[PDB]
Write an enzyme that holds these catalytic residues in place. Structure first.
Site, mmCIF file in Angstrom:
data_model
loop_
_atom_site.group_PDB
_atom_site.id
_atom_site.type_symbol
_atom_site.label_atom_id
_atom_site.label_comp_id
_atom_site.label_asym_id
_atom_site.label_seq_id
_atom_site.Cartn_x
_atom_site.Cartn_y
_atom_site.Cartn_z
ATOM 1 N N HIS A 12 39.444 51.550 34.167
ATOM 2 C CA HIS A 12 38.772 50.461 34.871
ATOM 3 C C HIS A 12 37.691 49.883 33.965
ATOM 4 C CE1 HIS A 12 37.503 54.429 36.753
ATOM 5 N NE2 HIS A 12 36.482 54.136 35.970
HETATM 6 C C1 LIG Z 1 46.358 54.713 35.605
HETATM 7 C C2 LIG Z 1 45.277 53.922 36.295
HETATM 8 C C3 LIG Z 1 44.575 54.481 37.333
HETATM 9 C C4 LIG Z 1 43.562 53.770 37.998
HETATM 10 N N1 LIG Z 1 42.909 54.394 39.026
HETATM 11 C C5 LIG Z 1 41.973 53.719 39.638
HETATM 12 C C6 LIG Z 1 41.295 54.338 40.697
HETATM 13 O O1 LIG Z 1 41.554 55.473 41.065
HETATM 14 N N2 LIG Z 1 40.319 53.620 41.335
HETATM 15 C C7 LIG Z 1 39.998 52.359 40.964
HETATM 16 O O2 LIG Z 1 39.102 51.803 41.597
HETATM 17 N N3 LIG Z 1 40.622 51.730 39.948
HETATM 18 C C8 LIG Z 1 41.572 52.377 39.309
HETATM 19 N N4 LIG Z 1 42.245 51.772 38.260
HETATM 20 C C9 LIG Z 1 41.909 50.391 37.866
HETATM 21 C C10 LIG Z 1 42.408 49.378 38.883
HETATM 22 O O3 LIG Z 1 43.445 49.984 39.638
HETATM 23 C C11 LIG Z 1 42.998 48.122 38.239
HETATM 24 O O4 LIG Z 1 43.819 48.542 37.166
HETATM 25 C C12 LIG Z 1 42.016 47.059 37.740
HETATM 26 O O5 LIG Z 1 40.773 47.186 38.429
HETATM 27 C C13 LIG Z 1 42.557 45.665 37.958
HETATM 28 O O6 LIG Z 1 41.627 44.637 37.513
HETATM 29 P P1 LIG Z 1 41.985 43.086 37.744
HETATM 30 O O7 LIG Z 1 42.525 42.918 39.122
HETATM 31 O O8 LIG Z 1 40.781 42.288 37.368
HETATM 32 O O9 LIG Z 1 43.148 42.787 36.677
HETATM 33 P P2 LIG Z 1 44.580 43.412 36.311
HETATM 34 O O10 LIG Z 1 45.282 43.769 37.578
HETATM 35 O O11 LIG Z 1 44.391 44.471 35.278
HETATM 36 O O12 LIG Z 1 45.316 42.150 35.651
HETATM 37 C C14 LIG Z 1 45.410 40.941 36.445
HETATM 38 C C15 LIG Z 1 46.466 40.024 35.880
HETATM 39 O O13 LIG Z 1 45.942 39.232 34.787
HETATM 40 C C16 LIG Z 1 47.076 38.702 34.152
HETATM 41 N N5 LIG Z 1 46.674 38.052 32.912
HETATM 42 C C17 LIG Z 1 46.046 38.609 31.828
HETATM 43 N N6 LIG Z 1 45.830 37.740 30.868
HETATM 44 C C18 LIG Z 1 46.349 36.545 31.350
HETATM 45 C C19 LIG Z 1 46.430 35.249 30.805
HETATM 46 N N7 LIG Z 1 45.970 34.921 29.602
HETATM 47 N N8 LIG Z 1 47.017 34.292 31.562
HETATM 48 C C20 LIG Z 1 47.481 34.627 32.772
HETATM 49 N N9 LIG Z 1 47.457 35.807 33.386
HETATM 50 C C21 LIG Z 1 46.871 36.732 32.610
HETATM 51 C C22 LIG Z 1 47.979 39.918 33.991
HETATM 52 O O14 LIG Z 1 49.329 39.590 33.750
HETATM 53 C C23 LIG Z 1 47.736 40.676 35.306
HETATM 54 O O15 LIG Z 1 48.815 40.533 36.219
HETATM 55 C C24 LIG Z 1 43.257 52.456 37.590
HETATM 56 C C25 LIG Z 1 43.979 51.896 36.525
HETATM 57 C C26 LIG Z 1 44.974 52.604 35.884
HETATM 58 C C27 LIG Z 1 45.727 51.973 34.743
#
Ligand SMILES: Cc1cc2nc3c(=O)[nH]c(=O)nc-3n(C[C@H](O)[C@H](O)[C@H](O)COP(=O)(O)OP(=O)(O)OC[C@H]3O[C@@H](n4cnc5c(N)ncnc54)[C@H](O)[C@@H]3O)c2cc1C
Ligand SMILES: COC1=C(OC)C(=O)C(C/C=C(\C)CC/C=C(\C)CC/C=C(\C)CC/C=C(\C)CC/C=C(\C)CC/C=C(\C)CC/C=C(\C)CC/C=C(\C)CC/C=C(\C)CCC=C(C)C)=C(C)C1=O
Ligand code: HEC
Ligand code: HEC
Ligand code: HEC
Ligand code: F3S
EC number: 1.1.5.14
Lengths: 136, 540, 413
Positions: free
Chosen positions: B476
């Site tokens: 994260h």
């Molecule tokens: C193994 C693992 C375990 C985890 N466990 C936990 C947990 O227990 N508790 C917790 O709170 N969090 C946990 N996390 C973190 C959390 O689940 C998410 O992974 C993270 O918070 C998602 O952040 P986000 O929604 O901002 O973006 P993400 O979901 O990471 O990405 C959002 C989207 O952005 C898109 N994107 C990127 N660049 C571009 C671009 N240039 N143009 C268009 N689209 C783009 C991608 O394709 C993706 O679909 C864990 C993560 C992992 C990998």
């Protein structure tokens, strides 16, 4: 089909478990032959050794045939049946999951992850003893 | 195309982007949601993990079941694809996993949905270290509850666990009962002086949101077969059902700013590198703590030579995470890991304290993932045959114990996310590159945490103790576009709107000014809902 | 509880007069999906302005047993007033007392039901009532049978109105009394044969199994879903054990009605010891968003095998039912299997909720297409259920649309 039968009997002797899936065994034999071109001869040699020295179980065969060149084949057969893979890479073909023999010794307590134990709250029960081999 | 006009355009269909899009379309706006990655099926990922080799199951491979597309690659660490380059003394602490697609990295996660303590929002004012958030805990509490109700978070409803985040409403569901491993660990660490308390999880202790109750499939990372846990694809599906347009395989790479430094249009590529132009009244980047600063730096203009919203030179800096110390051993008494979810409880006793002015607050936890794959692999590696092989497999499945201790890292401006000058992807976009250092804060916290982990192992009679000599990532990503009140010292304001451009919001975890002690995605969701309120206010 | 309250629970009148979980009960607004359109249940709370507060005993009896409102306009037969036509005077007055006393008034008008021509005018319904032959002399006990049989018949025919769904309709959408309780197609779901036929009906069910299914909807061979789940959850689970026993006693005496192409009971289909291939799936790795997974066995394993086991025998504690020996997968008509896959299962009994997620286009867990649903259903029927049944994508599409359109509905075109 004679080679497949030979492989299945050798596997039932090596793993020590008679209830071995025949489709998994067929896929394993196909992959082993695709990997080693002398696999059938090694199977025949192992079975001949077992039937000549009269090894009661795989423990006796393993103890009395540690230095022979056939030991790697026996170990590879055991590992392929127990783990469901033959190679050692991250893209290796998986031939048995949830029917692989390493998930069985603790299957009565521990979950095979993507498949469900009985019910959404089964874990409130006390687990069985470690000194009780379940089945198979 | 060439127009793709909408009221609001969100870049990234993760949990933040999809939640924002759903809230915006619920309130009459027209939303265009873009994602660099493809659409993914839950059952296909389940099949891919089931056919994933047992050695990739024993060691936690959370990226192989999701195929990486060449135009929008994500990180894979069984054999490393070198997408995210990491440097610095603690590079191993930033090799964290992301997934690109409709649903995002929340496709695979433990779903531990946590609320930060109030003191986590005023860390500098309380302890003199780190930075303060642009908003207090009381301002985010309604959005915390909104996110919890939307995602369906379990919790220890009636329980005085420890000084923790104060609640105005109970959890939507109550935490499901512990498995044998969690009960045993709780008793052992209670005898050791540690408070093992339930983890608030976006899981179903009862049927909720039309989705089943959790049957303990114990595969929360990397894929739930039945949907008894929250994935951001749910928010994406709900938003698309309400009229939002979702364009998969849309790698946004360019932005255009007018004379008032307001974004007028964006340009995104496609698997065949054909450029498409999108015009809107409000632009939001909800990509990552890694992808959002990367896009901001990549889209530099003549008005913005150093990057979009990079007038303070702080875009990509202050990269934060929770440096962890893994540990594995063989308990003296059976533990029987596998009953429930993969992370059901945690030691929240050291989340807060006056020590936080000298060394980092920590979170100690036990991993509830089943040890049958690891036990089978280890017993096969010893060359055992016959009954001894089965006995070894059963014993190591019953006795294998995994423990972790995660720390809090301070926002360091030298922990950057500059674009790599050596590596590019199929679209010619440079790979992300992070230089990471942990700091004496985390080093002292980690000395104490290593002592605590050794104490836990000794209390359990552990054998074959294997503590990782390096810090490990926790996936994260926080920091990169820091929030604050001063435009010259922050990237976004209290409402997640960039100080440079009034037409651009950053609904990402990169905005959080402190990493905190526990998982940080519920805070990201609450901040995305707050930004949704701000966006609705601007356009109405 | 009160006698009128008990009769209202037995008649299940608070389920269609309540708009789902919300919509304070007996206020109306629920949209019954009739073959001609949508019929909205009116306001029932004793409101003097928007409800039936100004209904006398005679007017309430007329509305309940003859489908005539206070102003004289005919009621649409989405009211089971053909079933309620034979309620005793004491029961009608008890229900009237319950409505006028127990339930608080709700002052909110319900949506006006608007049906296409020639069904727009609610005056031809008199001709429909004359043709249907619904009258209708009040129920009296048949002394040749015992009391339990008479109470069960009264519950099935008058109060619980089973024949509203289990008796097929004729061309004019009127009950076909010749095929009494022989099964019917109600919208996207199908109410099976519940006659005493051993192979086609529920004749082979044990008494304990039938009692348990009616009380809870859960049995080793049958789980209630669709309209049956709501019937049990709202009405049948609150009835006394004596009432369920009487219902079972009467159901055991219903003359058998056989289906065409039936050899064994729906719950007596054994499972074929066959399954998918793990090895063959290695080619489908790196193939996110399954569309090259056209194998029925692989699709069942990916989507369904987590809860129902790979051999289709379900969980050990019975939370996930065995698809082998199942009255839904074992039916010759695969309508209910398609409906279960499309819509899932949901049943709250004793404040505890079964939920199977839906796998239709609107699914949140795994949206499947008509072809994928048909392939999975074919695999389930061949390996766990009835091997003589078949599912095509067009059948799934028809189930999605609310079943096959009745001939009479051609007049609204
Ligand atoms: C193994 C693992 C375990 C985890 N466990 C936990 C947990 O227990 N508790 C917790 O709170 N969090 C946990 N996390 C973190 C959390 O689940 C998410 O992974 C993270 O918070 C998602 O952040 P986000 O929604 O901002 O973006 P993400 O979901 O990471 O990405 C959002 C989207 O952005 C898109 N994107 C990127 N660049 C571009 C671009 N240039 N143009 C268009 N689209 C783009 C991608 O394709 C993706 O679909 C864990 C993560 C992992 C990998
Ligand atoms: C003179 O000339 C003429 C005439 O005469 C010759 C005429 O007469 C007429 C006029 C004729 C008419 C108007 C005839 C009208 C006839 C009718 C309207 C009668 C129709 C009757 C029926 C169809 C009866 C059968 C159906 C019944 C009783 C349904 C009753 C409803 C309920 C109690 C609720 C049912 C619940 C349903 C459907 C929901 C199912 C659930 C799901 C799909 C959700 C998903 C499922 C799950 C999650 C599983 C778990 C379940 C639950 C949670 C004309 C024009 C004419 O010219
Ligand atoms: C009122 C007295 C009754 C009684 C005794 C029964 N029903 Fe129904 N029923 C309905 C539907 C849609 C189904 C199918 C189940 C499925 O879709 O999962 C059923 C099923 C049954 C059974 C089980 C038969 C089997 O082989 O599955 C039995 C014993 C049964 N019913 C008895 C629909 C309805 C209704 C909707 C309008 C109503 C009312 C009833 N049923 C009422 C009764
Ligand atoms: C993969 C798409 C499938 C298919 C083809 C079926 N299921 Fe399930 N199912 C679940 C539960 C909890 C129930 C019953 C209600 C309960 O007892 O509370 C069911 C029921 C069915 C039936 C009907 C059985 C009956 O006799 O009516 C059928 C035909 C069926 N299922 C097929 C639970 C689940 C799941 C939760 C983890 C999942 C996934 C599935 N089912 C998947 C499928
Ligand atoms: C969900 C199916 C259903 C059930 C069960 C049902 N009703 Fe109704 N009821 C309706 C519909 C639909 C209408 C109106 C249709 C019409 O206009 O023909 C109606 C009309 C009425 C009316 C006429 C009032 C008016 O303003 O139209 C009364 C009175 C009434 N119902 C009472 C009852 C009672 C008492 C019960 C037993 C508890 C009952 N209903 C059970 C659906 C149902
Ligand atoms: S995989 Fe799913 S069934 Fe529960 S244990 Fe994790 S949320």
């Amino acid at each position: 089909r004679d080679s497949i039968s030979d492989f299945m009997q050798l596997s039932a002797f090596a793993t020590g478990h008679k209830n071995l899936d025949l489709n998994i065994g067929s896929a394993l034999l196909l992959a082993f032959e695709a990997q080693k071109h002398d696999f059938s001869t090694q199977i025949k040699a192992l079975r001949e050794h077992i039937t000549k020295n009269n090894y009661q179980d795989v423990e006796a065969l393993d103890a009395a045939m540690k230095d022979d060149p056939l030991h790697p084949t026996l170990i590879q057969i055991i590992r392929a049946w127990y783990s469901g893979v033959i190679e050692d890479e991250t893209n290796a073909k998986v031939y048995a999951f949830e029917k692989a023999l390493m998930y069985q010794p603790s299957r009565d307590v521990v979950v095979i992850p993507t498949y469900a134990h009985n019910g959404p709250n089964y874990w409130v029960s006390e687990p069985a003893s470690v000194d009780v081999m379940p089945a198979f | 195309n060439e127009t793709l006009s909408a009221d609001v355009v969100i870049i990234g269909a993760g949990i933040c982007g999809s939640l924002l899009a759903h809230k915006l379309v619920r309130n009459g706006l027209s939303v265009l949601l873009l994602d660099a990655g493809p659409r993914r099926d839950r059952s296909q990922i389940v099949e891919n993990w089931r056919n994933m080799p047992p050695d990739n199951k024993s060691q936690y491979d959370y990226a192989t079941p999701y195929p990486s597309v060449p135009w929008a690659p994500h990180t894979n660490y069984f054999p490393d694809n070198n997408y995210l380059i990491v440097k610095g003394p603690d590079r191993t602490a930033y090799k964290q996993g992301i997934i690109k697609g409709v649903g995002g990295t929340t496709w695979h996660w433990a779903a531990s949905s946590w609320r930060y303590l109030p003191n986590d929002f005023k860390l500098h004012s309380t302890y003199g270290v780190g930075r303060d958030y642009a908003m207090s805990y009381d301002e985010l509490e309604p959005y915390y509850y909104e996110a919890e109700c939307e995602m369906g978070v379990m919790g220890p409803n009636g329980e005085e666990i420890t000084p923790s985040a104060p609640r105005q409403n109970p959890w939507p569901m109550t935490s499901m009962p512990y498995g044998y491993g969690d009960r045993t660990f709780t008793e052992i660490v209670s005898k050791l002086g540690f408070s093992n308390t339930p983890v608030p999880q976006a899981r179903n202790s009862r049927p909720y949101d039309g989705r089943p109750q959790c049957c303990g499939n114990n595969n929360c990372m990397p894929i739930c077969p039945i949907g008894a846990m929250y994935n951001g694809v749910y928010a994406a599906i709900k938003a698309e059902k309400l009229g939002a347009k979702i364009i998969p395989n849309a790698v946004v790479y360019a932005m255009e700013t007018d004379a008032k430094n307001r974004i007028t249009a964006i340009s995104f590529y496609d698997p065949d590198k054909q450029s498409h132009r999108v015009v809107a009244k409000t632009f939001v980047i909800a990509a990552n703590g890694i992808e959002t600063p990367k896009l901001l730096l990549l889209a530099a203009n003549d008005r913005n030579p150093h990057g979009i919203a990079n007038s303070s030179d702080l875009v990509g800096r202050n990269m934060m995470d929770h440096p962890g110390i893994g540990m594995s051993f063989q308990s003296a008494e059976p533990i029987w890991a596998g009953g429930g979810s993969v992370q059901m409880s945690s030691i929240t006793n050291f989340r807060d304290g006056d020590f936080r002015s000298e060394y980092a607050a920590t979170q100690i936890g036990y991993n509830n993932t089943a040890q049958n794959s690891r036990a089978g692999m280890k017993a096969l590696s010893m060359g055992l045959v016959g009954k001894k092989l089965d006995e070894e497999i059963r014993r190591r499945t019953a006795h294998g114990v995994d423990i972790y201790a995660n720390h809090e890292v301070l926002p360091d401006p030298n922990n950057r996310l500059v674009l790599s000058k050596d590596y590019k992807d199929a679209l010619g976009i440079p790979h992300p590159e992070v230089t990471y250092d942990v700091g004496e804060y985390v080093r002292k916290s980690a000395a104490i945490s290593r002592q605590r982990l050794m104490d836990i192992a000794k209390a359990m009679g552990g054998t074959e103790i294997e503590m990782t000599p390096y810090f490990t990532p926790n996936n994260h990503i926080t920091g990169g576009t820091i929030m604050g009140h001063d435009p010259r010292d922050s990237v976004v304001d209290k409402w997640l709107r960039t100080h440079d451009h009034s037409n651009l919001f950053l609904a990402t975890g990169a905005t959080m000014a402190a990493s905190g002690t526990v998982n940080s995605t519920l805070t990201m969701a609450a901040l995305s809902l707050r930004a949704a309120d701000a966006i609705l206010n601007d356009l109405k | 509880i009160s006698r009128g309250h008990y009769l209202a629970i037995a008649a299940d009148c608070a389920a269609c007069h309540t708009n789902g979980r919300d919509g304070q009960f007996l206020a109306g607004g629920y949209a019954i999906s009739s073959p001609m359109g949508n019929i909205y249940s009116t306001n029932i709370t004793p409101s003097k302005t928007h409800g039936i507060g100004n209904y006398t005993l005679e007017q309430f009896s007329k509305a309940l047993r003859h489908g005539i409102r206070a102003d004289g306009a005919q009621l649409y037969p989405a009211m089971p007033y053909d079933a309620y036509n034979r309620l005793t005077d004491e029961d009608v007055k008890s229900l009237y007392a319950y409505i006028m006393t127990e339930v608080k008034p709700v002052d909110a008008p319900s949506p006006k039901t608007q049906l296409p021509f020639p069904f727009s005018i609610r005056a031809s319904l008199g001709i429909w009532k004359i043709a249907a032959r619904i009258e209708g002399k009040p129920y009296v006990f048949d002394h040749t049978h015992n009391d339990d049989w008479n109470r069960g018949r009264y519950l099935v025919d008058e109060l619980a109105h089973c024949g509203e769904c289990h008796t097929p309709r004729n061309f004019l959408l009127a009950p076909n009394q010749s095929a009494y309780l022989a099964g019917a197609d109600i919208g996207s779901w199908r109410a099976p044969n519940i006659t005493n036929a051993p192979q086609s009906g529920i004749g082979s069910w044990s008494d304990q199994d039938l009692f348990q299914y009616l009380k809870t909807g859960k049995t080793a061979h049958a789980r209630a879903a669709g309209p049956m789940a709501e019937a049990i959850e709202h009405s049948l689970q609150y009835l006394p054990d004596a009432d369920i026993s009487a219902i079972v006693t009467y159901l055991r005496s219903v003359p058998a009605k056989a289906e065409s192409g039936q050899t064994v009971a729906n719950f007596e289909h054994a499972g074929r010891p066959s399954s998918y291939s793990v090895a063959n799936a290695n080619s489908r790795r790196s193939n996110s968003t399954l569309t090259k997974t056209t194998d029925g066995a692989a699709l069942y394993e990916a989507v369904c095998a987590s809860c129902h086991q790979s051999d289709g025998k379900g969980s050990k504690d019975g939370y996930y039912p065995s698809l082998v020996g199942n009255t839904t997968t074992g039916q010759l008509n695969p309508n209910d299997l398609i409906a279960s896959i499309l819509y899932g299962v949901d049943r709250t009994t004793d404040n505890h909720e079964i939920l199977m997620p839906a796998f239709g286009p609107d699914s949140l867990v795994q949206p499947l297409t008509d072809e994928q649903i048909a392939t999975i259903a074919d695999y389930v029927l061949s390996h766990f259920g009835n091997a003589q049944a078949t599912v095509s994508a067009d059948a799934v599409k028809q189930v999605r649309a609310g079943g096959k359109q009745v001939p009479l509905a051609k007049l609204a075109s």
